[PDB]
């Protein structure tokens, strides 16, 4: 019945979400970025991207995404 599925929604499902939200909001501080190494299997550029200067990924984050030549 609707009563049972509402009981599961508020008594189990949303409490789970609240606990995982608390878990996440406790491990949410920025990780220490690793030394840049210009590995040939990463930062692939076979064709320029069709936006910006051609060299930045779509959701480029300056803090954690280095370019082929290193961190900005």
């Amino acid at each position: 019945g609707a009563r049972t599925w509402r009981f599961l929604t508020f008594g189990l499902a949303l409490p789970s979400v609240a606990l995982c939200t608390l878990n996440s909001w406790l491990h949410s501080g920025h990780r220490e970025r690793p030394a840049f190494i210009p590995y040939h299997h990463l930062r692939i550029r076979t064709k320029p991207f069709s936006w910006g200067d051609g060299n930045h990924t779509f959701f480029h984050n300056p803090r954690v995404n280095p370019l082929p030549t290193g961190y900005e």
Binding site: I37, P38, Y39, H40, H41
Partner: protein
């Protein structure tokens, strides 16, 4: 030594990992022998096997990347 013998670890038509493993084994062995100041002739078997199996351009690329600090295998 004539050529690399059959190796039951790599019994199939794809020999990529045979070349790779012997290249790693040679360079790990050569680092260990240089590290204590030991002797690289101990590493000779691995050297002959990878030189026999591996494309020159693979060896040359891997060599360049080791010198660059971009070789992705553990040595």
């Amino acid at each position: 030594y004539q050529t690399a013998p059959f190796d039951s670890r790599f019994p199939n038509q794809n020999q990529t990992r045979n070349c790779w493993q012997n290249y790693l084994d040679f360079h790990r062995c050569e680092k260990a022998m240089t590290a204590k100041g030991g002797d690289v002739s101990v590493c000779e078997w691995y050297r002959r096997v990878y030189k026999s199996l591996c494309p020159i351009s693979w060896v040359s690329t891997w060599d360049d990347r080791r010198a660059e600090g971009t070789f992705p295998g553990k040595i």
